[PDB]
Amino acid sequence: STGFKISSAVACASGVCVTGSQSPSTEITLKYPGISQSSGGDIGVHMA
Amino acid sequence: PHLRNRPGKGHNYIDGMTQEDATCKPVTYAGACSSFDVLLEKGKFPLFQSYAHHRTLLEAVHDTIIAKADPPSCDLQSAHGNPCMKEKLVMKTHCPNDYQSAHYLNNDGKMASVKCPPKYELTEDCNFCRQMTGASLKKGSYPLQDLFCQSSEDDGSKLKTKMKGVCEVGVQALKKCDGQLSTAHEVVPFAVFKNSKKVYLDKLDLKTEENLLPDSFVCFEHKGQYKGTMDSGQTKRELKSFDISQCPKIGGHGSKKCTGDAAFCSAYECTAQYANAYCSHANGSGIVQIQVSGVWKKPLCVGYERVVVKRELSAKPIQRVEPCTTCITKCEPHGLVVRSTGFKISSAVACASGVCVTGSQSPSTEITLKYPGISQSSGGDIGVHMAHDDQSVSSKIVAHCPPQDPCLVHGC
Amino acid sequence: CSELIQASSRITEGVNTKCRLSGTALIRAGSVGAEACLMLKGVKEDQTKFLKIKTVSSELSCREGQSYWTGSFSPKCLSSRRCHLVGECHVNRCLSWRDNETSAEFSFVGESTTMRENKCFEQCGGWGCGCFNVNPSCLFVHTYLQSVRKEALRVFNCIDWVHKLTLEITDFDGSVSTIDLGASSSRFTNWGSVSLSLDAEGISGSNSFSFIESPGKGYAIVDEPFSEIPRQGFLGEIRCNSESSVLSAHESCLRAPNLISYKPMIDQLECTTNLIDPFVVFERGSLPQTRNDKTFAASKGNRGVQAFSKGSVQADLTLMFDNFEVDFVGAAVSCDAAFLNLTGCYSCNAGARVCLSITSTGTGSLSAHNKDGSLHIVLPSENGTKDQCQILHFTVPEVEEEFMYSCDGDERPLLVKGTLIAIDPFDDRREAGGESTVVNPKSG
Ligand SMILES: *[C@@H]1O[C@H](CO)[C@@H](O[C@@H]2O[C@H](CO)[C@@H](O[C@@H]3O[C@H](CO)[C@@H](O)[C@H](O)[C@H]3NC(C)=O)[C@H](O)[C@H]2NC(C)=O)[C@H](O)[C@H]1NC(C)=O
Ligand SMILES: *[C@@H]1O[C@H](CO)[C@@H](O[C@@H]2O[C@H](CO)[C@@H](O[C@@H]3O[C@H](CO)[C@@H](O)[C@H](O)[C@H]3NC(C)=O)[C@H](O)[C@H]2NC(C)=O)[C@H](O)[C@H]1NC(C)=O
Ligand SMILES: *[C@@H]1O[C@H](CO)[C@@H](O)[C@H](O)[C@H]1NC(C)=O
Ligand SMILES: *[C@@H]1O[C@H](CO)[C@@H](O)[C@H](O)[C@H]1NC(C)=O
């Protein structure tokens, strides 16, 4: 995230979601939700 | 008594009964009208008393909002042998004494009325005329229904009664039903729209929105007021009605100076000179919209009635017949085994001449149980009661087995 | 996948003779993103109507308890100083002044609905002060609160969380149906009703935080216990029962004792107070926050809050009186299908994704069944060529099977290839499972 820092975030892909928590930073990494990593597709992200 | 400043003409009189034109032609603060003062009695006509600044049925009729039915009022003196008294006989009303006439809104959405022969009065149920010697009948007609009307242009030709579980409400035959018919008297709200008939409603969801049209303002004047109508010495402090059509609109022309409150000054042009009348904004007026089929509409009239409704309680409460036999029961030396085709069995019990044996397991198409008592040695018939996951399956079955040999059971 | 033989009806040529199928169905609900299948078998190469129950998502919704409203308020004070023995400047009246009693000087206020209080303070008495009398004078102060911003915040708490399942009802000849329902609850849809058991867990405990809602702006979480009594220096020191009361500073609002600070210095009085800005606290704790591995967030559609926690549930939904049949479906239709690919895992709640290219001349479905009948594939067929996808379950690293596919017509073979990835559990004893699992946080 350019500028604003991200502390906690969540990623949803066809029902299954995965969360992540970290110190406020310009970037954040999360585990892939379900088989979206294998199947690709579109994944929604909601972050604070 | 601000409620006597009627919107529009305010003609609260009916054709034929024109002996009270002194006070029933435009209703004002001064006189008394028999066909209007009943509406303002406490505890009676609460729906209109809430919407007190909307037109009545007679006012709506005289403003051409609501039409007059064919034979507008078939007099019982001359038409008592005609099928007239039909929509009235399905309503449960209550008239006071000394009333020779009573008006109502018929099924077609027009105004009809019942008029007794001269010197007769309507009884307490408004169904019969009776004569009392030396009685002074009132000069007006009793409003039978509790309703208020308004002017609307919204079309309602596609509007119809949609009541669930009702075979017939009032004089309308909703559908054809056979069997039980719970018939009773119920209070049904109803509405009348443009180019339609009466529409009974299951629910009354209505809202009002305000505006600045002339019907939303109450304009009055004082009696004995300087430079006004009736400019002469008075012995009492009384008010007088004023016509808002004279006060000029904002940026327009008019014939009388006119002052008022904030809403009037925003809508009309308030004068800077000595004014001729005071125009307040209507306590409750506006436009009332009724929610029908989930969409708002503008009704001509809204009220409620006490009519006879026929309902259907039920066609069938519940049907519970389950002669299911989709399982195979076979007694085995290892144990009593039943395989249930389809539905799974979690827990079961077996009865054999008093003694019973239970068994519990995960839901599965089959279950095995220990033999009850000496039924394994003696064979016979053993009852089984099991709990299925599905429904419509008999839970009581019987298994017939011949005597068994325990040697295979305990063989080792 | 599931028949209705005990309640099947003759669904004459062409016309429909459905007899209002009353037999209920007891089938296990699919996992998140999976589907539940029904079989309505009539005449071969005819009928074959499929009712599908898509499992959209499972959320741990909140059951709100008490609630209130709050906003930003600032005070305004009117002062009037009178010498001794003037008006009610008697000392006995001066100390015993009730806070709810208005002085005669501020009668232009008259009757008002605003939150207000009245105080009386003694001052100097003497010619230096300004009054010939030497007894102490009086200063009457009338203070009223007014709202600064034209917004309000609603503060509530979640007494408990309830499991809540969203279903997409692909009905016969039309899939315009989406429903949402909770534990041991039924919804009166078309063709009868749909009930959900969800016998595993109907609740997921409680909490001791508070939640803020800004209408049209979202939600937030504050890390304080929900207090029903106002407290100075906390949130909800001034609380009301509606947004209008907050925006109008109505007198019905409750507040703590001693919020207003008075500075009766001899030149002019200073009426001021320090108040926790609820908007600052709302912006501080916007919803996507994780507390002890719970990760509360906004529910889809922003109608509430969720709670992502580790866990799973068992759902067994039941149909009843399912009857939706017409006559025009008597005609047959042919398609053409082409296997596309296979991805996903095995023995996993996520499952394996299959995709199929359907080349069909019109509306229809697909009923591919494997040799043993264990696995079923259903996909709608439309005019032209389309690419549909489905979710299945497997227990093998490599998938190589043949299915008997036919859309209300001639039976044809379809061969599926592909392998499946292995999910690393970092700890395995027997197996993973295939039940309905709720969303969980990473730290769980
Ligand atoms: C296995 O086959 C699948 C089926 O084709 C592929 O999954 C999806 O295929 C869709 C088309 O067949 C793609 O739809 C496109 O999506 C993008 C945005 O994602 C849209 O802009 C396009 O309009 C839409 N349609 C077309 C014709 O492009 C899906 O994107 C796609 N899903 C993905 C890529 O995750 C798989 O891609 C395929 N996998 C492998 C490994 O071959
Ligand atoms: C030891 O002798 C007993 C006495 O005969 C047998 O026990 C019962 O004998 C009855 C007849 O004598 C049987 O009655 C029949 O039951 C079936 C259903 O069970 C009915 O349909 C018949 O109408 C009825 N009558 C006749 C004439 O068939 C009993 O069934 C039977 N009890 C059983 C078999 O458990 C014993 O069978 C017998 N045992 C041995 C090892 O020889
Ligand atoms: C003096 O005048 C005040 C009013 O300013 C009055 O309230 C008070 O009672 C008076 N005191 C007397 C008459 O002793
Ligand atoms: C509020 O004021 C009224 C009249 O001023 C008084 O009767 C009542 O006791 C007051 N309430 C209090 C002091 O709690």
What does this protein look like?
This is part of a larger assembly, with 3 copies of chain A. Chain A is mainly β. Chain A has 1 helix and 3 strands. Chain A has one helix at residues 36-39, and strands at residues 6-13, 16-25, 44-47. The longest helix of chain A is centred in the last third of the chain and has 4 residues, at 36-39. Chain A starts with 5 loop residues before the first strand and ends with a strand. The A-C interface holds A 7-10, 14-21, 30-31, 34-35, 38-39, 46-48 and C 32-33, 55-58, 286-290, 295, 297-298, 308, 343-345, 348, 350-353, 421, 439-443. Residues 85-87 of chain C line the site of one 2-acetamido-2-deoxy-beta-D-glucopyranose. A molecule of 3 linked components (NAG-NAG-NAG) sits between chains C (340-341, 355, 387, 389) and A (39-42).
Major interchain interface with per-chain residue totals? A-C, 21 and 29 residues
Count of beta strands of chain A: 3
User: What oligomeric state best describes the polypeptide chains here?
Assistant: part of a larger assembly
Spatial sequence of strands, sheet with the most strands of chain A: 2-1-3
Shape of chain A: elongated
- Tell me the radius of gyration of chain A: 11 Å
In N-to-C order, the SSE pattern of chain A is EEHE
Beta-strand residue percentage of chain A: over 45%
Please give the alpha-carbon distance between the first and last residues of chain A.
11 Å
GO cellular component, one term (chain B): host cell Golgi membrane
GO biological process, one term (chain B): fusion of virus membrane with host endosome membrane
Domain Phlebovirus glycoprotein G1 (chain B): 1-412
Subcellular location (chain B): Host Golgi apparatus membrane; Host endoplasmic reticulum membrane; Virion membrane
